[PDB]
Ligand binder design. Structure first.
Ligand SMILES: [Mg+2]
Lengths: 117, 117, 117
């Protein structure tokens, strides 16, 4: 797929997702939420959406990823919403791997008002 | 698919998920977890399950969605488990968009006790 | 699929995921993150990855699952990264169901540097 930016790395065919990198150093105090810039824009393949999920390396530090849905039509830069849910202050260095983008298939169902049985 | 209730909106074919709406006003203090009612019941299509995930608009306020698996067989009303992980009190207004329901395919594997190599 | 260990249970064909069990009693104070051992190792089927997600029963207690991606190639024991984001201390008993493993398909896209339009 077409991407713009160097904040996303090539993955092995066997890997489920692509690593995403912090475009700049971020400091997070306990309880702080910040939208971390990655500098990448992309064109997701038709029929799919992207799921942003946290890396185990950073999750084990007590940092979570919030939100996380990139719709096929999104064309803006990708920012990752992160919160420090631990009781310690953390510094994310520039170009540190902060999350992963995983491509998943889309399913459209029409909604029919009825009576669930 | 068959649904009952007006707490879920039609999505564009290109969107990955359907927006879910709070059935009533909810107040969340820092650290509080509450199960927010949406008023909708549904019949998921055979072969799929539903993933409830948070909206970026609310995730950026420091609210997270916990749990989040709706099995094909679930027939009860959908409630979203939300926590305020920020250091500020938040009020969710009635019929505010609080999360998204995304339909994903099911995979059944039999479990074979062996030796992973 | 081949698994080793008794910390994972057989699921009904209709269920989206398999329940994962704590291999030992864990105590979590508010704000603490711990990697909970399950004792299981597995060989995921080629073409898929596994998503670890939290159970509604434990999510409603204010416990979250962080990280959560098992790549097809992972051969080590599965540990679940959990945090107590509530304001109350919690004890997870040995062999308590703490999360679910859901098998999802893999999608590989080559990355092409271009201009997103
Ligand atoms: Mg979370």
């Amino acid at each position: 797929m077409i991407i713009e930016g160097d904040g996303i790395l090539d993955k092995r065919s066997e890997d489920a997702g692509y690593d995403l990198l912090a475009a700049k150093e971020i400091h997070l105090l306990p309880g702080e939420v910040k939208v971390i810039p990655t500098g990448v824009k992309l064109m997701l393949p038709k029929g799919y959406w992207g799921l942003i999920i946290g890396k185990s390396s950073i999750g084990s530090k007590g940092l979570d990823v919030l939100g996380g849905v990139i719709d096929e039509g999104y064309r803006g830069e990708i920012g990752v919403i992160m919160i420090n849910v631990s009781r310690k202050s953390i510094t994310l260095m520039e170009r540190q791997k902060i999350a992963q983008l995983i491509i998943l298939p889309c399913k459209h169902e029409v909604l029919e008002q009825g009576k669930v049985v």
